[PDB]
Design a protein around this ligand. Structure first.
Ligand SMILES: Cc1ncc(COP(=O)(O)O)c(CNC(C)C(=O)O)c1O
Ligand SMILES: Cc1ncc(COP(=O)(O)O)c(CNC(C)C(=O)O)c1O
Ligand SMILES: N[C@@H](CSS)C(=O)O
Ligand SMILES: [K+]
Ligand SMILES: [K+]
Lengths: 381, 381
């Protein structure tokens, strides 16, 4: 089902997943449908609307929520932009972000701070991978003007799964000028951790389809709890965002998540993500896949512990499929990742902390892990 | 090269262009390159950046401008959203729009009005298709508080080519509170009218590749004159928008137009637009192509004039490839467009004014036009 795995040793799912054959077939079939029946026509436009609704529904079912809470986007970042630019910020309002957030997300925050006169402070979570409590660190940083906390459910740099439920309680127990809300960056978590937003109570959860879900680059989504929808004003909008009047004029915002969708998008790619989502559910439940992912990451982590010059950041088994580690060598992590790539072994360098990250998916196997171990064994001080 | 033309009679280029074989080949080849070399790796990431640079450069050459003025987007609307949300609006600032702008664009202006307390009015341009002066109408509406004028270079509803140069001069000569700037919606003009931003001076020009340029749905762009760049603050941003420091931290904005680019997009589609652009230039100059488009639209227009129950909105030959008309019939224009599609003849209904629109491209032939005319003749009072 995943042809790209065969002639390589891939551990970069968190960067982009290997596209399954059913996804490529769906993409290709959609271009064909458009060429045959349109591309612009009553038939083609109806087929596109039906496709969009099917993908919105598939995502909704994935997270066990109502389709109205789902916005389709192009990537994780756009979901964060929609939430951050849509909040009715006031001068002096404060945003707290962990010290492990993506530089792109930090950039939106700086842009917001410049535009609305809000302020932002980081709180340290990287150091809580093996000890401490990230929820308690947050409690020690909440203030009177704190309105939004931004965190990645699964940290892209260290592989820690933040204690989201406990963190939500902490924010909800806080008595301040604002009911503290939390925007979750789910780039690594969605598609690997079992996520059920009925059971787990969240405010805003941004994700993408091109990483753990193994969809094509260019399609992602955003979840907004039904009760937080009214707090998010549309910013980037267009013809997909509105309801229409008698003369084709705008009369209001489209229902639910649609108000945040803009204009023409890569429709064939939506069919690709839908097909990939369906393939995963056929393999087993999110829970079974998650256990399989952990089985592989612990196997890799154990092997790495056995190599004398490799040092895993985590001192206990990985909580998900990310395994970060350093290598004692005169070379530097960037050179080591390049040398591994020359051997068709694919990992990624992490800037902070300075280390190397491997991603194990449920489709990763022991021979791949053992091959990675074999090649790393050669680096030394 | 344009396979989709066979077995249908297509006049919806303005909605979406028929994708050329070279474009589909380039899209498929890109998925293949990503499967073979990544999809996330040093090699794959470099190849994607190179592809992005090639597309930006090709767009730059298309309009005779420096690549630094080009932003890659997903559609026409996004370009307008970048310009509109990026300007530093103050209560009472005014935006003037023609009375023929797209509903999605009007909706952005409305969201802006609500958030910054700006105001907007329409100047009547529709009525200038056959008489009057749109530039003069603009002059009589220009005021001390007008900060920006939004207009479609080629009107999507009536097919009028607005006097952009004159209208630009009108705006330059004005003496008001703000130096008056003009944002152009080039959904219909780009790819049909010969456009040179070195010989034609514009401030902002939003376009897409999926209409007259015949690229895939999902890739477009925005031109911002260098003198206007600083006035546009990045709004939706992400990892593609910034430069990086030593610990991978944001250190400023990416070069030129890159700062308004967000995050992961459908890269294979970029290869598709690049290929469609290169084909579009393989077939004569923009002028030769524009003359061909007009030879086709005048032939349809003339033909429609001969049909007793059809009435073209334009009383002189169309200035571009759009030919709008009404039909005298109890059926209504939507039923007629549906019936035409039942015969694999593809046109579209326009909501204001109530009419039908046909798009003639340089690849449209007289047999297709004669076919549409034979079937249209069947309707009557
Ligand atoms: C926490 C997190 N947020 C946001 C993103 C940006 O992805 P989009 O392009 O979908 O907005 C990533 C991607 N990470 C990568 C690439 C990685 O860690 O290898 C991420 O890990
Ligand atoms: C003037 C104008 N502006 C903006 C758009 C929206 O395009 P994007 O999806 O690329 O933002 C269109 C679309 N027209 C159509 C569909 C038509 O003429 O049939 C348009 O004609
Ligand atoms: N290439 C950078 C972009 S920051 S989202 C990275 O993925 O680390
Ligand atoms: K070790
Ligand atoms: K007539």
């Amino acid at each position: 089902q995943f042809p790209g795995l065969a002639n390589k040793t891939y551990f970069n799912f968190g960067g982009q997943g290997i596209l399954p054959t059913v996804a490529l077939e769906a993409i290709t079939a959609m271009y064909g449908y458009l060429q045959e029946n349109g591309p612009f026509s009553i038939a083609a436009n109806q087929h596109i609307q039906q496709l969009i609704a099917q993908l919105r529904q598939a995502l909704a079912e994935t997270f066990n929520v109502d389709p109205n809470t789902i916005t389709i986007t192009d990537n994780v970042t756009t979901g964060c932009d929609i939430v951050l630019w849509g909040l009715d910020w006031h001068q002096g309002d404060e945003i707290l972000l962990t010290d492990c957030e993506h530089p792109g997300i930090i950039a939106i925050v700086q842009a917001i701070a410049a535009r609305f006169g809000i302020t932002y402070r980081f709180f340290p979570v990287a150091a809580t991978l093996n000890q401490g409590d990230a929820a308690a660190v947050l409690a020690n940083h909440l203030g009177p003007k704190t309105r939004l906390v931004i965190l990645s459910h699964l940290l892209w740099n260290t592989g820690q799964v933040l204690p989201l439920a406990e963190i939500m309680a902490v924010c909800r127990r806080h008595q301040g000028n604002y009911p503290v809300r939390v925007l979750v960056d789910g780039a690594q978590s969605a598609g690997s951790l079992p996520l059920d937003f009925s059971r787990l109570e969240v405010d805003y959860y941004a994700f993408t389809g091109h990483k753990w879900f193994a969809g094509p680059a260019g399609v992602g989504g955003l979840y907004i709890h039904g009760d937080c929808l009214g707090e998010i004003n549309p910013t980037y909008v267009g013809w997909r965002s509105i309801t229409y009047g008698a003369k084709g004029e705008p009369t209001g915002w489209a229902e639910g998540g649609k108000r945040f969708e803009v204009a023409t998008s890569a429709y064939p790619q939506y069919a690709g993500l839908l097909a990939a989502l369906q393939l995963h559910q056929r393999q087993g439940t999110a829970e079974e896949r998650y256990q399989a992912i952990c089985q592989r990451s612990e196997f890799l982590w154990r092997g790495l512990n056995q190599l004398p010059h490799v040092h895993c950041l985590a001192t206990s088994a990985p909580q998900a499929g990310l395994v970060s580690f350093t290598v004692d060598s005169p070379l530097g992590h960037r050179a080591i990742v390049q040398k591994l790539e020359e051997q068709r072994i694919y990992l990624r360098t992490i800037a902070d902390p300075d280390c190397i990250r491997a991603c194990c998916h449920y489709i990763t196997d022991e021979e791949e892990i053992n091959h990675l171990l074999a090649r790393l064994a050669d680096f030394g001080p």
